[PDB]
Amino acid sequence: KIFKNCVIYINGYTKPGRLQLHEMIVLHGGKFLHYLSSKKTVTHIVASNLPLKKRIEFANYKVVSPDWIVDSVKEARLLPWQNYSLT
């Protein structure tokens, strides 16, 4: 349960796909959102890249590549989000 206390919102197209990532998230203790509510709930946003508008919309969120999830799972430990930050 490496993703305990993580609440993840996936934005845009990703590899692996959102459904596969959602499985990995809930399989390892975390939650995901279908709708980006606010920073009250969301702990991390996952995205492959960010058009300027999204870089503005998601400023001061932790925005990380999907590798963060994949790599943390393979290592069986929560890797530092900063290593995978887009910004």
Phi-psi bin for 16: left (phi > 0), alpha (psi -120 to 50), beta? Answer: beta
**How far apart, in Å, are the Cα atoms of 79 and each of 10, 27, 39, 40, 68?**
18, 17, 21, 22, 7
Cβ count within 10 A of residue 64:
23
Stated as kind and residue range, the H or E segment containing 63 is: strand 63-64
Sheet containing strand 7-10, edge to edge, reads: 31-33, 7-10, 44-46, 63-64
Q: Enter the resolution in angstroms.
A: 2.0
* CATH superfamily, domain at 1-87: BRCT domain (3.40.50.10190)
Task: Give me the residue label for tokens 């993703």.
Answer: 3
- Which method was used? X-ray
Burial of 33 (0-12, 13-18, 19+ CB in 10 A): middle
